[PDB]
């Protein structure tokens, strides 16, 4: 018997888990790939294999015990599998150096796009106009004259064309040309710099879905009820050998292989 008021669900608010909240709600920091004992970490206190007992955590169940969440701290950030296409599209709108939207209220047809009510219809339209923008323009025509220019904030720098190369995103700059994979850490910073206004324009929500959360820095680990496998074990093993490589300051290519090994696992998870 439970003390709590009984209710029905009236609303469901969808959103992305922030890294801070995943940390906020976990019952255990998790990071060694082993299940004697017990029960590294993992699986604490997550918990209750079967029966008795009785957590921790908590105090029932099994069968009463909900199951609880742990977290793994990812040595580097990684793309969320599901959002690469979005992540790419956002990059195609935001200036890739300074974070500013590539077109704004000064542009003829961007005003028409911004007015759109349904936030998927609007994102479509904004992306359509900006994937063309090949510069983060410092100054613009306005009305008026031209002659008279009008200034914005950013910045000058050229934009890349972005290609999907499996799980990596590839850049292409000029106006022969300069190729460069765009690293996760780099996009994570761009996204963090996009304004509340600019990312709302873009269909994100400042409370429930900031675009940076599309980039994972902190995996939620599901409890035994969710996995009554061991993919996490491999995600962990990749995560380990990536930390034990920075700790050894080993060459750029070595860090990168182990980074995309981790990417590979958080991705196929998932």
């Amino acid at each position: 018997y439970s003390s709590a008021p009984l209710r029905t669900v009236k609303e469901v608010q969808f959103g992305l888990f922030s890294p801070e909240e995943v940390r906020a709600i976990s019952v255990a920091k998790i990071r060694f790939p082993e299940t004697a004992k017990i029960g590294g970490l993992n699986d604490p206190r997550l918990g209750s294999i079967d029966r008795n007992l009785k957590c921790q955590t908590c105090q029932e169940g099994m069968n009463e015990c909900p199951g609880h969440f742990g977290h793994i701290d990812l040595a580097k950030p990684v793309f969320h599998v599901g959002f690469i296409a979005k992540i790419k599209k956002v990059c195609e709108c935001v200036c890739m150096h300074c974070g500013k939207l590539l077109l704004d209220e000064h542009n003829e047809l961007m005003r028409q796009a911004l007015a759109i009510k349904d936030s998927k219809k609007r994102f479509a339209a904004i992306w359509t106009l900006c994937k063309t923008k090949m510069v983060c323009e410092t100054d613009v025509p306005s009305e008026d004259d031209p002659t008279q220019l009008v200034s914005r904030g950013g910045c000058g720098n050229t934009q890349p064309t972005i290609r999907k190369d499996g799980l990596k995103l590839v850049g292409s700059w000029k106006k022969e040309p300069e190729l460069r994979v765009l690293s996760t850490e780099e996009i994570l910073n761009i996204f963090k710099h996009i304004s509340v206004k600019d990312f709302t324009s873009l269909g994100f929500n400042e409370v429930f879905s900031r675009p940076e959360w599309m980039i994972l820095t902190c995996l939620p680990v599901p409890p035994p009820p969710v996995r009554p496998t061991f993919k996490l074990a491999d995600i962990l093993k990749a995560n380990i050998s990536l930390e034990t490589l920075e700790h050894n300051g080993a060459p750029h290519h070595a860090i990168e292989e182990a980074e995309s090994l981790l990417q590979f696992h958080v991705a196929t998870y998932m």
Binding site: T8, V9, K10, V12, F14, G15, L16, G203, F204, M214
Partner: protein, 155 residues
Amino acid sequence: YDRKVPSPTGEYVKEPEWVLETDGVNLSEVMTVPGIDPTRIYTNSFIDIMEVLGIEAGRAALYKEVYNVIASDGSYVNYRHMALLVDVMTTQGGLTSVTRHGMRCSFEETVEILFEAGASAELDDCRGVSENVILGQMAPIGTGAFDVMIDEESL
């Protein structure tokens, strides 16, 4: 055509009139030719009507069309039913397609729709039958559009 029109003494009387029926449409330009009555001009292309006369005209024409299709085979359907359809298709200010195409909630259930739900910060109001089934609850339709609770002042 025959036209039912009141007479100087009051009763409806048939006044026949010459009408022109065309193949092809240019509403804006024809509407404007001298000798016609532009207050009565009509076309079966409710799209052109909405573009020249506006949605409210667009709406009424859309009604006349759906109506004719049903009437064409002798059958009769109460006004409100087609009125409702026509309002749904018209309510956002343009002509929204119906059949096209086109929560939560839940048949495929393309994880990809939940991903966008997540990134969009989409808020499910939970009025459908289906999200209420997943949640094991009565849907707020008909018999469940209200709560019931114990009275605590009846003798």
